[PDB]
Design a protein around this ligand. Structure first.
Ligand SMILES: [Mg+2]
Ligand SMILES: [Mg+2]
Ligand SMILES: [Mg+2]
Ligand SMILES: [Mg+2]
Ligand SMILES: [Mg+2]
Ligand SMILES: [Mg+2]
Ligand SMILES: [Mg+2]
Ligand SMILES: [Mg+2]
Ligand SMILES: [Mg+2]
Ligand SMILES: [Mg+2]
Ligand SMILES: [Mg+2]
Ligand SMILES: [Mg+2]
Ligand SMILES: [Mg+2]
Ligand SMILES: [Mg+2]
Ligand SMILES: [Mg+2]
Ligand SMILES: [Mg+2]
Ligand SMILES: [Mg+2]
Ligand SMILES: [Mg+2]
Ligand SMILES: [Mg+2]
Ligand SMILES: [Mg+2]
Ligand SMILES: [Mg+2]
Ligand SMILES: [Mg+2]
Ligand SMILES: [Mg+2]
Ligand SMILES: [Mg+2]
Ligand SMILES: [Mg+2]
Ligand SMILES: [Mg+2]
Ligand SMILES: [Mg+2]
Ligand SMILES: [Mg+2]
Ligand SMILES: [Mg+2]
Ligand SMILES: [Mg+2]
Ligand SMILES: [Mg+2]
Ligand SMILES: [Mg+2]
Lengths: 113, 118, 207, 120, 53
RNA sequence: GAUGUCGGCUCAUCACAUCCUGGGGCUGAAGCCGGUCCCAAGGGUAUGGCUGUUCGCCAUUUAAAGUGGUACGCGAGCUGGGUUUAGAACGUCGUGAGACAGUUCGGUCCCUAUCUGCCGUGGACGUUUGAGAUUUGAGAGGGGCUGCUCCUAGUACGAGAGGACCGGAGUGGACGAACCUCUGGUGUUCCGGUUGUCACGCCAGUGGCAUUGCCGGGUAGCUAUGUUCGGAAAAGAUAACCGCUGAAAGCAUCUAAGCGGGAAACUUGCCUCAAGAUGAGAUCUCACUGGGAACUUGAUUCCCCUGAAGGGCCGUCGAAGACUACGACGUUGAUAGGCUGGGUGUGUAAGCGUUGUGAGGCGUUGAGCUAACCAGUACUAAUGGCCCGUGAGGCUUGACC
RNA sequence: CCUUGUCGGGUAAGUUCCGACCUGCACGAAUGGCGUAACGAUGGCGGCGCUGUCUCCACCCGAGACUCAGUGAAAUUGAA
RNA sequence: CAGGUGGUCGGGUAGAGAAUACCAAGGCGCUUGAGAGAACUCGGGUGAAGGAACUAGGCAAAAUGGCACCGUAACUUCGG
RNA sequence: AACCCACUCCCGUUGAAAAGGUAGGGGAUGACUUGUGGAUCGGAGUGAAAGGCUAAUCAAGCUCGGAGAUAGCUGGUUCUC
């Protein structure tokens, strides 16, 4: 229980409650050119691990006609903010069936209001 | 390589092995003493006791969960009515294993499996 | 000198700026001193050092009387460290207090043993084909020697067997944190062996 | 792209549509090429009129891949599609407008041109 | 493959010198005075002085 | 009374007449580059197109894509494209069967390793009384590579173009060892979805077989395509070469005497094994203090009492393992299974109640199930037994009451 | 034969392939000469899809190999 | 002794079907077993990023596959 | 698809088998496949022709006689001085 007890002290609260199938917006830090600033990265969440400090989610954005996905570490001092803009029912845990579909086929349904 | 892995194969396929331990348990809850083989008794004690722990709570959902893994009317009837009530206040450790000699034909070491209060 | 610990699993800590430091956590029992080998009865100069909690019914009377020349009441293992020059008494106490930040150290230990390994895993050989006419030989070694002269296999040929649990030392790993309350060292990098093993932490001399 | 004979398209206006890797420049035998490395391409399928003819040895830098780029964190950016940007004899680009996103991992002193020309 | 010379009486008997037997884990039952194997049920059915079968 | 022939794959080892890196002499060597010759074998020494090809010719690299020996290394290690038995065909030669050191299509590659050898791993005995544990290191292996920038400095050099030596800092490639926190993979023992059919008396619910029926996910372990670390610095003795003093030979002269500088090679330095190192080493600690007779006198042999320190069998097991061996533990008890709480995974179980003519939806509703993980707990299994090992450790000499 | 003859096409690069040239060592007209739609388990090149063929292998499931009890061969051999 | 041997009978649910998947009547468990879960060999399952770079040669594996309708080239012996 | 045949890979080679097996292949209303009964024979038959088949034997079977064929060719040839 000695690494299960160090890992309580790195965790200081940064994140709200959410699920796969949401549309989050993420404020990340940008360290370039000797000036720190923020940057907004908004997409749809497709994955979650829950190992403690080793928790990490994944969010897919369609930027300028090109897909991109970004895996964020949860308790990093880079992932600053996390807001939830929409939520819906998907009845699965990992949405990896959206690396193929593109447009109207990749619509998250709405049972959940 | 087997590092920290658990469960032994016994040189049977995975569907034989499921349908054999289901059949050694269903005969143990009729006669309450079985003369069996020693490596087959060390792995019977990881199948039988989750049926005795389950029998301590009567439910329609538990009598369906019990029927769906030891599939017999007589074994479900022998639980929930005799067992799970005789063992109502013993936490764990429901049956014992006593090594007994060797088989005549081969040398397969034997064992008894016996319920603990009988 | 050095301190004897235990591998207790890998973790990961974050700095202020944002990078991740992979960290191996090492638990240290405070180490008692058993002997102090001087140079006039023994030649060399060294120190026996002992970690604790062995049951009383497992020590022989040869070892129980050996652990009572100094009031130690000792446990598992006796290790010995060769040292340049420092005085030590018979019954002393060696803690994690001689380490600081930075301070690149050496870490020894037994590795994890794989049973009886072939030549594609032990020595990283290459394989023959899989479809183009090939016979039973798909992962076997190739040839061994030359034909008529020398007529025998040279000593030191690379063949199969026992990727060992032999001793190995990782070299020049740096210390991230010293904890004199829960008795921890935090080392950035990999430490040899399985979790729950036994390990030695020595200040490095390669530098 | 990341291996010899890896079809990958270009992210450029004046270029072709598809090219193919033939040699990973660098060391003795670099087997793979990540984001921000110089490869050497042949032009495999041109646009009916651009600038670059079909079947010409050129030089390109790699800007997007499906394997991803990894930072000093457990945080990786991973696209879907491979993408290159052609160069001249000197390492300046040929075209004018770059299509799609790039990463900020690429920006060094010699590559301050194409980072400014792209919508990230 | 085959041999090229036959093996003598010496080099045949040296091979089978690592091949002996043992089963000495015997025990006397305290109650019945019956001999059996250590950590086994006695051939009458007693284990540590208790009838089980 | 048989030594299986060319090229490829796999695995290699030596030579030096050096391709690269290291040290230097001369130059028709300004600088950057070179040319040529002495010293040096430590580590390196390309992917492809075409051909049966080695070879070669090309395209693109690179610090460089060295030359030879080992049955032109290697078929009881692989292949069988070439040569190549029987079939068929073209061109040529012979009236004819047929042939060609000319072409073209098709054509079975055998072996369970006894000995030397090698890579792993145990048994027996020895080390002069016997045990438990820790070690010195005689000797032997492992490793050894290199680019590009940037500062020195656009300085020395040169009409200009072009541009350094010595030193320092940075981060790449190829190779190696370890290791799963991360990023992934696998995960037929975990949880879902679903197709055909048989069954449990029927409806519901569920279970067999269909490659794990076909798939979606995935804990532990294992793993690389991931993560970290490595190659040195320095010291000695030298090679080529550069000398300093200095005669023989009044001068000169690196040598005859004397005195230095000198490279990845050599010897240490760093990691591992290592007293079977028969030369069998060294420290600490523990154990055992009974007779008798025969016959011969390191006195030997027998009889009887005694069996210690300890070890082994046996049992529960292990990130140890082909068997062994090693390591932890046996009621002085957390060694393994179960049980009780977590954690992780999966994605709102059945039953009821509702809405609807019905499939279905909704309270039921983060539900239920959850292998290998963590923490606790004597509930079951590790039996206060047997066998080995004895009884004070020879003799000579010197010191030493 | 000399020979990878010379010229064009296809590939970043083509001793094979396709189209021509005529200098046919040694083509040629029922041992038939040149064309030819459809058919070939036929010979040779090229392309799309596709992939553990391959960079370079990692993991899992069965049957052997290994250990224990029963039975129990073979080729070979001057002597060690 | 995994081979060879002429002719009749031949139910049910799906399906064009004597193919194929489960079952009825009826019959069998293939005359050495028990372990443990090394290399390597055989018969299989999945795979990051590439997609013939392998090789004498896409050999072998992977992929394609049903019924209904739309749609269809050069060429030709006028059928294809 | 039964059925007849034998194009590819791997396994097997002391095989389960003196020519198979597991996966894939070609023909499948005819120059078809096959059951029973007969006819053709050793310099002789048959042959959509390979020198193929004629009882696991074929550029001329198998068996018994001539016949203890012939061998300038190999191998062997036995107690003492
Ligand atoms: Mg869509
Ligand atoms: Mg099945
Ligand atoms: Mg192990
Ligand atoms: Mg094979
Ligand atoms: Mg010799
Ligand atoms: Mg011979
Ligand atoms: Mg030389
Ligand atoms: Mg050869
Ligand atoms: Mg062979
Ligand atoms: Mg050989
Ligand atoms: Mg050296
Ligand atoms: Mg139903
Ligand atoms: Mg059935
Ligand atoms: Mg000793
Ligand atoms: Mg004792
Ligand atoms: Mg005529
Ligand atoms: Mg004709
Ligand atoms: Mg035909
Ligand atoms: Mg046997
Ligand atoms: Mg039917
Ligand atoms: Mg793949
Ligand atoms: Mg893929
Ligand atoms: Mg090749
Ligand atoms: Mg090729
Ligand atoms: Mg094929
Ligand atoms: Mg038939
Ligand atoms: Mg067929
Ligand atoms: Mg047909
Ligand atoms: Mg012929
Ligand atoms: Mg015949
Ligand atoms: Mg005659
Ligand atoms: Mg004769």
């Amino acid at each position: 229980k000695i690494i299960q007890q160090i890992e309580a002290e790195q965790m200081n609260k940064e994140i709200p409650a959410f699920a796969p199938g949401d549309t989050v917006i993420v404020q990340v830090k940008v360290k370039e050119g000797d000036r720190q600033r923020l940057q907004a990265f908004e997409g749809v969440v497709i994955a979650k691990r829950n190992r403690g400090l080793n928790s990490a989610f994944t969010v897919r954005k369609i930027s300028n006609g090109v897909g991109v996905e970004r895996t964020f570490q949860t308790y990093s001092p880079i992932v600053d903010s996390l807001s939830v803009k929409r939520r819906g029912d998907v009845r699965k845990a990992k949405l990896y069936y959206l690396r193929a579909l593109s447009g109207k086929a990749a619509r998250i349904k709405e049972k959940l209001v | 390589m087997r590092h920290r892995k658990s469960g032994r194969h016994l040189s049977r396929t995975s569907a034989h092995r499921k349908a054999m331990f289901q059949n050694m348990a269903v005969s143990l809850f009729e006669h309450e003493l079985i003369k069996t083989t020693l490596p087959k008794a060390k792995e019977l004690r990881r199948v039988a006791e989750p049926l005795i722990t389950l029998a301590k709570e009567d439910s329609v959902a538990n009598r369906r969960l019990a029927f769906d893994r030891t599939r017999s009317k007589a074994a479900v009837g022998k639980l929930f009515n005799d067992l799970g009530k005789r063992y109502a206040n013993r936490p764990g450790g429901y049956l014992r294993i006593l090594k007994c000699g060797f088989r005549a034909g081969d040398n397969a070491p034997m064992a008894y499996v016996e319920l603990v209060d009988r | 000198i050095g301190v004897v610990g235990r591998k207790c699993g890998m973790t990961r800590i974050f700095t202020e700026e944002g990078v991740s430091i992979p960290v191996t956590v090492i638990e240290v029992e405070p180490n008692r001193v058993t002997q102090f080998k001087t140079e006039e009865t023994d030649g060399y100069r060294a120190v026996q050092v002992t970690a604790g909690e062995r049951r009383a019914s497992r020590v022989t009377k040869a070892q129980a009387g050996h652990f009572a020349k100094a009031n130690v009441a000792a446990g598992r293992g006796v290790w010995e460290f060769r040292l340049g020059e420092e005085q030590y008494a018979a019954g002393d106490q060696i803690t994690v207090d001689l380490f600081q930040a930075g301070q690149m150290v050496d870490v020894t230990g037994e590795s994890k043993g794989k049973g009886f390994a072939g030549t594609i895993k032990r020595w990283n050989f290459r394989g023959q084909d899989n479809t183009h006419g090939n016979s039973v030989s798909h992962r076997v070694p190739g040839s061994i020697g030359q034909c008529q002269t020398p007529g025998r296999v040279f000593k030191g040929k690379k063949m199969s067997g026992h990727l060992g649990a032999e001793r190995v030392t990782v070299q020049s790993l740096e210390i991230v944190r010293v904890d004199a309350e829960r008795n921890l060292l935090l080392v950035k990098g990999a430490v040899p062996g399985a979790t729950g093993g036994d390990v030695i932490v020595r200040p490095a001399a390669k530098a | 792209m990341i291996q010899t004979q890896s079809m990958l398209d270009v992210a450029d206006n004046s270029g072709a549509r598809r090219v193919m890797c033939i040699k990973v420049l660098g060391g003795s035998h670099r087997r793979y090429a990540g984001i921000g490395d110089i490869i050497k391409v042949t032009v495999k399928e041109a646009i009916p009129r651009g600038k670059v003819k079909k079947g010409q040895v050129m030089t390109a830098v790699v800007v997007r891949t499906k394997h991803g780029v990894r930072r000093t964190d457990g945080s990786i950016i991973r696209f879907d599609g491979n993408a290159a940007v052609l160069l001249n004899n000197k390492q300046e680009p040929i075209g004018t407008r770059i299509f799609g996103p790039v990463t900020r991992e690429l920006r060094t002193e010699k590559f301050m041109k194409i980072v400014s020309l792209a919508p990230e | 493959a085959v041999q090229q010379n036959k093996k003598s009486r010496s080099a045949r008997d040296m091979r089978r010198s690592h091949d002996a037997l043992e089963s000495n884990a015997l025990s006397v039952e305290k109650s019945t005075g019956e001999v059996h194997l250590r950590h086994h049920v006695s051939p009458d059915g007693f284990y540590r002085g208790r009838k089980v079968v």
